[PDB]
Motif scaffolding. Structure first.
Motif, PDB file in Angstrom:
ATOM      1  N   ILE D 162       0.785  -1.024  -0.107  1.00  0.00           N
ATOM      2  CA  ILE D 162       0.046   0.125  -0.044  1.00  0.00           C
ATOM      3  C   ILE D 162       0.819   1.307   0.074  1.00  0.00           C
ATOM      4  N   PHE D 163       1.117   1.982  -1.277  1.00  0.00           N
ATOM      5  CA  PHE D 163       1.794   3.169  -1.173  1.00  0.00           C
ATOM      6  C   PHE D 163       1.067   4.158  -0.539  1.00  0.00           C
ATOM      7  N   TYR D 164      -0.227   4.253  -0.493  1.00  0.00           N
ATOM      8  CA  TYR D 164      -1.071   5.338   0.552  1.00  0.00           C
ATOM      9  C   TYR D 164      -1.243   5.023   1.764  1.00  0.00           C
ATOM     10  N   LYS D 166      -2.161   4.243   5.616  1.00  0.00           N
ATOM     11  CA  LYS D 166      -3.081   5.078   6.610  1.00  0.00           C
ATOM     12  C   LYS D 166      -2.738   4.351   7.940  1.00  0.00           C
ATOM     13  N   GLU D 167      -1.600   3.686   7.928  1.00  0.00           N
ATOM     14  CA  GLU D 167      -1.578   2.743   9.246  1.00  0.00           C
ATOM     15  C   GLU D 167      -0.632   3.367  10.187  1.00  0.00           C
ATOM     16  N   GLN D 168      -1.382   3.741  11.395  1.00  0.00           N
ATOM     17  CA  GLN D 168      -0.614   4.350  12.558  1.00  0.00           C
ATOM     18  C   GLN D 168       0.393   3.531  13.248  1.00  0.00           C
ATOM     19  N   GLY D 169       1.489   4.174  13.463  1.00  0.00           N
ATOM     20  CA  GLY D 169       2.688   3.585  14.183  1.00  0.00           C
ATOM     21  C   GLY D 169       3.624   2.724  13.563  1.00  0.00           C
ATOM     22  N   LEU D 170       3.051   2.456  12.200  1.00  0.00           N
ATOM     23  CA  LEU D 170       4.060   1.715  11.462  1.00  0.00           C
ATOM     24  C   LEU D 170       5.354   2.315  11.090  1.00  0.00           C
TER      25      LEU D 170
END
Lengths: 236, 236, 236, 239, 236, 235
Positions: D162-164, D166-170
């Motif tokens: 996933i280029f875009y 939305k993953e928090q903390g990654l």
């Protein structure tokens, strides 16, 4: 050798074995509580001993730290050495709000963050469950000794140095009484071999409120736990 | 004590530490290859030593069996003892059709059936990866010593007594060269501390063909492996 | 209404409740074994009743089929109705080679193919574990009645019409004694509320060898099981 | 395919050299062939995924686009190793970084790559299979950079589907464990090379710092590309 | 009996069956909308009926709460009773910002936190998908009755009493229109048998804004939904 | 205005057909769009905007695999304010009652990708086509007297599958199409409150090993593209 990790010959272990993580504690148990004890293993320094307690054959041996380590030793004890009952004895932390340092915890089942039990049951939830006769023997032995006990769930983690946010609060919400590193690996191995296992631990630390047993309190807790376990072996 | 599992004080470990599962093998390494050696730990029988190899300070210590065990010892060595480099040394099995018993394997990365690295990376695939300077130092030391080596992936399992159908065939298809129990737990801890780790192992058994190294072969392979590791420390 | 699924008022349930999947069996229990019993719920046909057994307050209520259904009813009973103990009573299959049709199984913990317990414990293995006092009261009641029992693990599946190859053989290898659909959902809810739960079931079918209890054997097994549970409530 | 050697490649068997450079953008593959290969010929045009074969300093070398993402590179690389008998693939591209000691314009040589894809679990019975570069390839890139006096960072990549994001903390977890490069393909390439007993590696230039938001200017990106491609080309002479 | 959970004889269920969780709602549908109606199942209080709507045979039966419950009843209806089409009818919550209480939702597919569909498709994502002929028949019936409908995804949860942070917001972000407990278990069973299923629900509550349908709104929406479903059966 | 597309907002129509092969995108624009302008060629991923029977319509390649289509589709909905994307392509089938040359309209797509679990807290998130789009495709095929199969697709990350038992499970549950992208498209449309669908023609039966001839692939493509184009008029 009879196994890659144990120099004992078949027959050198009694059918009942106490095990603790620290081999030097196994030696202390043998020296202080077993009669006519003989060392039967020293491979990897994982000391094991066989003698009697009140006339009945009994062995004690270290298991090392963590599920993979106890799994090696216990698999061998049941499969090669034909052991019938293993009682794990140790220390633990607690998160439960009504469990305190110095308490004695008798484990009915243990959760885990390990994958070993999922791999035994097609990826599903396999509860690491203590044998009821062993649990009852520990409970009844403590009652006869007038030693209060807490009976309930443990949680066996692979990671002593946890960085996991929210874990302790979830364990507390569901009333896990003991946090340690091995029991969830032992119980399913006993099941595989149609044998028996249990676990008893003393609380050294409260993980939430940070109380910690003094050295003297730890010695007293240890003496209470070990007497409970030893007396339970006579009923097993 | 500086940690619950180690009686050494900060400074007692050199910046580079060799570690093996068996504390008695750690002692053999210290006795036969270190000068100026002193014992710095014996808690839980997990012998550790500090001395010099060809004039350079070096430590060697046991780590016990399995990811949870090495994780305790290595977390402490990096965090409390300020160690910069750990090289794991040990024995392994192989499944690779072109790897043979007696061979020396230098590990570039290690797979696992443990959950410890998923827990570090939001559930994703986190490759347990050896430090390139460490890998290169082992490779170049072996070349300089005229010792052929296999270089490639290990697989670290929580279960020595595997019952898993199809695992060995998959490992072989993707040319995993070594099967052991600890390296996948070490490398991410080194990463967390901004430090370095690697692994080198000797093939004791071919898991597919069932060939096994003779005692003579295990001595030869140990001598090769340990010389490579020791010479590599001089380059690090 | 006090809850969306129950028309009973707070206080209409006793502190101890027997539950079974079939509400018409809850009615049969109330009609044949409870004194002065009154119907306290009929929402969704999920009949519930409160009376006394040997003069001690006791309720009985259906829970429907599966983990999601029992979870609704048990959560409400512990939270809204302030119930202290739930004993689930029912029938089960077995895969264990030494468990037979008509056997009475007292559950110490239950595995599952449901996700509900992973969701409670940060994705980890959370053993659905019966309360020891409840298990013991069931065991001791059966002893007093001279009814042999099997004591050990259940497995709670979401899928009655299983198509899963290898499951039965793995359950048998690890000596799961009972296959049913609900207990693994009940025990963690009891934990959440600091309350007690257990389960007793009679074997109607051997899943592997295909023996099946006749209607008459089913009635006799039910009579034995329900008497064990009722007598256990007098000790709790 | 009805007539082609694979469903996605019009090259005939033998049209690829044993060593292939690959990048996501087929127009970048063309730029590499035009500017650095001699004796060059276009060997694929299917789906616009341009590929070329010529020589670099006398030695046979190919360059071909791989498209974006693990499924795309997996198709092309599986075919290159299986049908075209390629022995070594070096992926060349750009990346982001989260590491606090890696900066835009840095050249990253990848030793292994993590991922949020399921493709490697599916190869190893659901377990952790590290997507691991071949050591001879890593070493050749490192040594080529040293000879060119170009500094490099060597370590782990992370290949996301996933280029875009939305993953928090990654990003914070990647930084804590010192992942040096974030891209979309390397974790799919390395296990296929393993399956065929072949070799693979990856080198990338940092275009963006995902944490600090520093971003290379176009002139910095041109210099970075020239350094990276020179390192890779010189490495092929030693492979 | 034809199955363990249903006393109807084969043939007593029409080829099309409407199902809802509450058996008392199944009875209401039969009493108010079917002619020539007779009760065909009473087992477990899970009332089922068969009659005619506008001359065409139609059945209605309760399915209980949750995926495991509907799975039992639906598997039996397709396999034993040779049913061709099941239309689930019920109530739901909504999280979608453009959906309001009182609305009627026609379900095209349903997500879930259950494991039942992963277990059917080798651990992968298997969308529980309504049959297009059924969806179309519901959409066209509503159009003919001049009743507006929302058409889109449901989410079927195993846990009514959710404690899961962030779930509602993710469901809203992706425009799930209905939250319920069963549809995701029904559609794959229909697929297995080469049969048809769909779902239509009325919005009782907005999970985000906390709006709740008044009793009059619930009656209006029920009347709309059931008429849509009944008219659709004439075209199926 | 994005790293992968040189177009600017307003350069794409509100309705976009997409296929994996950018050269097939060009074929569609050349042969079916009036007044067509090329609006992108970054990475060779050709896109075009013209009209079909008077209505604005675009057509653009999406590349192979979920990660590739996700980049292009996210941008189309977010930057370019596209409202409807219809994926057009080829597929395999395992269904015993689906044959080469059949036209498959997708209602939902399963997958072996992790992208949808990551959007819904690890749970099962069905990649679901918008009903108005499905219906428009079905009705357009009816108007053209072309039979269709309507049902589930399965989107895989791995073209060169080595997975035992997969085809048999897909067949048992009557998945009609196997391809590589639709399961990534539908949730992105959901995120932006927009619409997506997919139509594919069967080139290969994965179980029987029947494969379409060159003539059959031309007839199938012409049938499918006409259905999709006529559907855009109703959307």
């Amino acid at each position: 050798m009879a196994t890659p990790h144990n120099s004992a010959k078949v027959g050198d272990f009694a059918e009942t074995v106490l095990m603790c993580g620290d081999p030097l504690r196994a030696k202390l148990i043998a020296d202080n509580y077993l009669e006519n004890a003989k060392q039967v293993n020293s491979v990897r320094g994982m000391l094991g001993f066989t003698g009697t307690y009140k006339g009945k054959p009994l062995s004690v041996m270290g298991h090392g730290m963590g599920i993979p380590s106890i799994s090696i030793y216990a698999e061998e004890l049941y499969n090669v050495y034909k052991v019938k009952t293993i009682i794990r004895v140790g220390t633990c932390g607690t998160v439960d709000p009504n469990v305190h340092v110095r308490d004695v915890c008798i484990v009915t089942a243990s959760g885990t963050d390990s994958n070993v039990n999922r791999m035994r049951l097609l990826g599903h939830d396999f509860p690491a469950t203590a044998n009821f006769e062993v649990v009852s023997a520990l409970v009844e032995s403590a009652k006869a000794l007038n030693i209060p006990t807490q009976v309930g769930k443990a949680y066996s983690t692979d990671i002593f140095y946890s960085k996991e946010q929210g874990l302790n609060e979830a364990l507390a919400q569901y009333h896990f009484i003991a946090v340690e590193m091995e029991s969830a690996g032992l119980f399913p191995i006993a099941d595989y071999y149609g044998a028996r296992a249990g676990c008893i631990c003393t609380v050294s630390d409260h993980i939430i409120t940070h109380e910690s047993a003094t050295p003297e309190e730890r010695q007293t807790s240890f003496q209470n736990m070990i007497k409970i376990a030893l007396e339970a072996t006579l009923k097993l």
